[PDB]
């Protein structure tokens, strides 16, 4: 399988096993969902009837008053009472099988080729750490919303991209599945494709 480079006008061979396989929507879904769930902070709590501030004094006697029997002013039935099933902080992280994670990456990359969204180049850098330069390079290469996967993360291109909200710049080790799907076009350097191939096998 051959990915053509638009910058130098050539070809680059890649494994059919990584860029060729059909799109397992179900498997990608499980992995995209697991990624979102892994981003959750899960930091909250309410107060049970145990934790609300007040005494354990029975508000009135069990019998004779003509009122509904009461036991605690903290009863969740009462205004100002405990929350019946008060939240505690939760870990929302899911386990994703290594093979299912790698499976999903292969499905997503294979789709990024079929929808002409994986734009492979040979060399992608800027001269100085200047946002004006990368903005200019991106309008010439003719894309706005883009994920730029490079071999080794160049400090200058990192800094240039930082203040362009549509543009993200990562090393091949840093590809997540949500970012591969979220961005309109993915610009991979030939060097990076080699690493992503080696990484997924």
């Amino acid at each position: 399988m051959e990915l053509v480079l638009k910058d130098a006008q050539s070809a680059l061979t890649v494994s059919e096993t990584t860029f060729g396989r059909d799109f397992n929507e179900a498997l990608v879904h499980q992995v995209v969902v697991a990624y979102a769930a892994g981003a959750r902070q899960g930091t909250r709590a309410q107060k049970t009837r145990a934790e609300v501030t007040g005494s354990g004094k029975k508000p009135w006697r069990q019998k004779g008053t003509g009122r509904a029997r009461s036991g605690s002013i903290k009863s969740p039935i009462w205004r100002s009472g405990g929350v019946t099933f008060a939240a505690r902080p939760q870990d929302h992280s899911q386990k994703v099988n290594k093979k299912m994670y790698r499976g999903a990456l292969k499905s997503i990359l294979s789709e990024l080729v079929r929808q002409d969204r994986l734009i492979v180049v040979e060399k992608f850098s800027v001269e100085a750490p200047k946002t004006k330069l990368l903005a200019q390079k991106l309008k010439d290469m003719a894309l706005e919303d883009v994920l730029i996967i490079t071999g080794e993360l160049d400090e200058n291109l990192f800094l240039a991209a930082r203040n362009l909200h549509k543009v993200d710049v990562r090393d091949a080790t840093g590809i997540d599945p949500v970012s591969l799907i979220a961005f309109d076009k993915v610009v991979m350097t030939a060097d990076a494709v080699k690493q992503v191939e080696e990484m997924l096998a």
Binding site: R61, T65, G66, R67
Partner: peptide
């Protein structure tokens, strides 16, 4: 809402004893 109920107050008549 309802006011907190009163403690027992004096009763005018005894409850009739069915026994």
């Amino acid at each position: 809402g309802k006011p907190r109920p009163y403690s027992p107050r004096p009763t005018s008549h005894p409850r009739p004893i069915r026994v």
